[model samples]
Target chain A: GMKIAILGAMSEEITPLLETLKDYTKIEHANNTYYFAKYKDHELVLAYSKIGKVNSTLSASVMIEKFGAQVLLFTGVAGAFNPELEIGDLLYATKLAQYDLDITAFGHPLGFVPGNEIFIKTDEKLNNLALEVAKELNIKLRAGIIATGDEFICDEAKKAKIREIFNADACEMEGASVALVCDALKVPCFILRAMSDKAGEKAEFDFDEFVINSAKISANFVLKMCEKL
Target chain B: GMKIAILGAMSEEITPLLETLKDYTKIEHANNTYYFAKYKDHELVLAYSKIGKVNSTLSASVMIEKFGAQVLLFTGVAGAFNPELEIGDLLYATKLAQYDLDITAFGHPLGFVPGNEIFIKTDEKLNNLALEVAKELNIKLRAGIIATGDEFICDEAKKAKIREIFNADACEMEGASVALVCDALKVPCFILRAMSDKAGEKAEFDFDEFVINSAKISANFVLKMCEKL
Candidate 1:
């Protein structure tokens, strides 16, 4: 199995995931360019790229181009659009979309290209494997579309539109950009998110209160799944 | 009545307001460093901050500290938490909270300080005036809370968390930081956001589709209000 990697922006969102893999040996990879933790059988590397699309792209590129990570898993907290998912429900992203992408000058679809659709599907193998592992661990999970953008979709109407247009079950800030890099590198990638809040009605809730716990559960499940793979 | 100022990051968010005030005379204030326009009985100053907290703060400060703006109105688009708010529905932020502020070391609240609570209540008079203007225009309006952060809150969970913790009805990338500078300078500030997308669920829709339209509505409303003020 290839080494695993984690990327997130917020400290509260990453703390839970870190706690789950505490038993691993910490090591610096690629001339101190990145941080990795070695467990008994697998190695996991992690870093927090400040924020925004540029930061996310730079971090993902560094993790792949600099470090020798073969399998990259971007796991952290996210927002859920489907009301059924609720707070704390885990998600395995089957596809990712960048809601903010706009380049109509080249005659591309508002958010699409000739060969590429707005929704970019994640690795099918990893998606299925994650589902199996989630089932075994009894972690409630859903597999569907995840949208990414630089603007917060705070209102209900916008949330509904995202769900309707993209058929997205959940949304996150950094997934699509990270996925873009992974696709470019031809490295197998997976995005697992724990729903911290419902998309519309419960849009206002203390994220810090729930993110740590959610990160822990999701990261533990990912580590367990890595063992199975 | 004091001269009113409007600030925006994207030009689309400022065009409509500028058009509405086109008949006004250009006024060079602040040693000719600041330019504004004066209508029949109203004065309007408009400027684009580009993006990010730093630019927003600088633009807002210049509008107040140097330009002699007594009342500052930020007219633009924002992500809403309330599903009832459709695109072009104006939102009057009665309070502003900085979603990214964190300092637990000094026993302060996550986004609060002894006298620097991130939740800043807007000037009551301004809120009332905005509500009146919204009613006259027959535009659906709500005055509640707004959260501002340097990073875009695009995900469902993060949006929900922001609304939960801050009770924010809407989320934008720049409002709170600009509000902070205005508050420090004792310049009355009001943020009027036309809902473009619901923060959590609308993660999939074409954000660019409605961003410009929503911004136009907000700016026009602000222009009308400035005329009355």
Candidate 2:
């Protein structure tokens, strides 16, 4: 009886998961595309966050406000902010921090906003299901802060700064913004990302190759976790 | 009688405007800062959109939701995606598009999202006021679509794609997202930008000089326009 909203950062990330959807109906509203489907006995509203916090935020809002999503689940590929993370390893965000939200003049640290926090927690219950899924799948994963920023983590200096500022394990574009928007409505949310690149990868290391593979790891866990929750 | 919110993208743009506020109350937001003040007999809620559409959307939502802004106005500098526009010319967003959104798999074009249009309009009345203000102030102005994206837009190919897809007269980070958020609440919203870079400007252009100059132009006009509305 629960509707879970599942989103990914890009099309490639969500394609495999789409094949598994059953009885899905595609609906276009406000120019966005949504697929209403049943995923392993769970009613699901699946969409993409369109690659940044702005698009993701808009998508998140509609899912909660209109589609009746009680749980917001997003899975994607992220760059390792923590050096220990390797490609294809899963990273579930316990808290999402906007590492690029710099407003020191307001005397607040980075990523802190009014009526919002520097780091927002993902859904505890959903995360628990994820933990079970992770163990059952025997996938490599680490749980910690997932820092979100509009800037790509291709810069080494920015990578160090992110780890230092937020103690973040991984970084991506949409996760934290989704957390904040979901937080606004007090919706349970989960942001799961698989490692696509380490801070040390040189000259864009066949990004699509890693993205598709990494996406699959997170996508599988999320789809399974969907049924469990 | 009504509260108007004015914001821009960064500190330098909003800091100078703060000096002109009367009865201003400094409100420290979780991440950013806001000043609730009187600017020439007008009640104002002023803040910045940070730097990207995501940050802009979050700030816009706060201004509307928490600050209770009846009218929302954003002032800043934008890169000219429209080749017809030149530096220092003011651009008013009749419509805002999220240029970064790509969801073509669902038979949707780029920037498509549900519950939000690919292109969202600014308040007609407010944009008309901007036209009058432009003529009265002897400032060059154009009113049309503003393509919003998270990218800072240094690359030429990406700029070309934006112009072609959105047919936007200009491009910036926040305007479209702000328009969409305001649209959700049916609030009157306006996005004004002074051209800082044309579609052809090289990377070495004194971007800061143009940004400050452009900010002053839009900021002053917004303040004056505030009292009339």
Candidate 3:
């Protein structure tokens, strides 16, 4: 079986999954820690990054370059732009559009970084299995575009701009940056996010309140999906 | 002669240099404007980004990949961490460390991202030329490490922490990120940061008052250095 790597954005997102891993050995390199273990039939490696795109991209690079990961998965919590998606609903990003960029004036979409794909697409097979896992586990799941950016989505106007430009259902940090790293290395990566809150007047407050729980739920979902890959 | 790429973070930092370039044609790519021209027999490409590390890194990457810049130079304003460096004094980053990554606890410098360099040292030839230009132009110049991060340096504690971790003389939001981008391309880059203010209580307000003049000085310095090339 091929090696699979798991990534979390912060301690809160990774702590529960750490508890679940068996025969895992931790390795420290650069400024972060990576866990290597065997999970069921896959050679599993887990790592967590400090919050933000740069940090998470670094996490993905370390896993690919140093740990020899064949596949990469990022599990985290995101704020939903689509109000239909509620808290704890699983979101498997088919493509990640980094919306923090100000390229709209250039007649381009939100994620248009030069020399990179406008949208960093995820592996189709992995995203399809995510839908199946959610159904088997009886968890609410949505599969579509996921918007990624640096700023926390709090303002309604920002949410509308992102949703309109990227045609995305949710917004979060880390996913698109990870996609860029994985793309450069030709590694297939899947982004699994749980909806933390809806972007609205009270989004800032709700994001704080629901982010931790949503992170845990997303991480466990990643673990469940790993059974097939 | 190899091509030189000039960049600034905001309009105030770049406007002066824009005036200095001759036979320039404006080119737009990746949400930022690029000024392509020939300056003093050297092929030059100048551009400016919005504010922040992500934006600056993107700017540097575009110059390398799209414009094929052989050397990268950044002219900007940074808050001084050392009280000895007064506002209006020039700083040339001999080395840049991104002090925001929170990895110094693991015995690495603050810029130590996994699978990347801990300290991004400036090109030796570029460093020497900057020093000579400062001397020729009668500008006060200090050469040392410049720390970069996403957030502006405001608190006294943050100033102290950065100084202790990276031993940096100044703090900014863009320089070290540019270094990371250049390092990946194996391209030589230089960071020029004139002091906006000391990183203390009035950093935010003082940054406004001093940043423009500092940027003008930095830009003019780059222009004068280009002539010598």
Candidate 4:
């Protein structure tokens, strides 16, 4: 059976996904823990990356090196920078940009690290597949850029400028960070983000309010994609 | 005798403080891994927190838990938000805001965490003491708020948002983070920030260009406070 992995930032997002696929066996590898849920001919392994860049990067690396998950899917809620992306709209990121990379001392560009590119493009096949799934599901989905950094993009001016500079549709804390690690390891990765808040709108939303619905939508999409693969 | 600890984000900020307090007895503690320097009747322990919130928080917790330091004085250079605060002017922080806390699930405001309040007011006694020392030394000092998070506020827009929300005179990476740990342990904490760059100004000064002078000013002010104590 083809194996697919789902990573989220918190337990709230992971809980519903686990419940949806509760029939599969659980496996604990050395330094890596994953819940394996078998459905027909495919399996889904899910884990939460906690929070922050270091945690996300390390978890993704562990998933690849230890569990041998060649393809990884990160699904969670993110602040939507695109006005067209309303609440609950899903985003399949084509590329990931880290807005916080600053290495000026080495004469690198303001947000560029040596040997590391600004935007890491997603796997073309996986990205296109995600778009197709969204279209089939009749879900409002946009495939574009997603920016990752330690800072939360809440203010209007910062979010507007970031969108203008990076052309990011959604902003999240951990997805692009994990994408960096996956890119380094030659692992194919895809990020699907549900719009939780309008960037700079100051509208408040909670995880409990949307996590179950978002997780169900994401899990089913990934499960169907796994069967296709 | 009250124990006063000094913590810095980088090594450059630690050097001049080390030099100015050369007269103090440097006692190697825990197999020479950590050094404790004492001046007059007050004990001063210095350690670098490296970078980021985790490291800074852990170091501060260790300083209070292991060293028994009742008072922590974090003196370092910070990017200024208020236009009136020029480079080299001292700024005392009244309250500290951790700009990173987000638990929307719990209905807490962004940057508000359970157990750790969004804004932790510094010890009024310590703050007034810093002001008295600054006034005695004829150093222009501005006190209001200070924003701390993992992200570096390098641009004007980001700095303006922090200032507008937190009402901060200056912003730094490590101060409020370290303060959080100290506050948790019931230790009195003070953050003295020397303006290294004006808010909205690009980071133009290198450590080699400004660290020694800024550290000296910090150390001198700290020493004055220690003498009074």
Best candidate, DockQ-wise?
Answer: 2
Candidate scoring better on lDDT of 2 and 4: 2
Candidate 4, B1-229: lDDT as tens digits: 8888888766666777677667644443311223477678677788765555544554565566557778888877877778787677777888887666454534667666333366877888988887787778787777878887656566778777778877778777677767655665578888887777664545654434565677667756766788877
Candidate 2 chain A weakest ten by summed lDDT: A199-208
Docking quality of model 1: it rates as incorrect
Residue B146 in model 3: lDDT: 87
Better of 1 and 2 by TM-score: 2
Query: Which candidate ranks first by lDDT, i.e. highest?
Result: 3
lDDT, candidate 3, at A148: 74
lDDT of each: 0.68, 0.76, 0.78, 0.68
| Candidate 1, number of clashes | 23
Residue range B162-206, candidate 1, lDDT tens digits? 878888788886687667656655778888888877755444363
True contacts kept of 3: 0.01
What TM-score, to 2 decimals, does candidate 2 have?
0.64
What ranges in model 4 sit over 4 Å off?
A1-229, B23-33, B100-108, B206-208
Q: Could you give candidate 2's per-residue lDDT for residues A136-215 as a string of tens digits?
A: 87766688888887555666787888888888888888898898777766788999988888744451563545888888
Candidate 4, residue A131: the lDDT equals 72
Predictions: Cα RMSD each: 14.5, 7.5, 9.2, 9.8
Candidate order by DockQ, highest to lowest?
A: 2, 3, 4, 1
Q: List the residue pairs that clash in candidate 3.
A: none
lDDT of residue A81 for candidate 3: 81
Number of the top-ranking candidate, with TM-score as the measure: 2
What are the models' TM-scores?
A: 0.49, 0.64, 0.60, 0.55
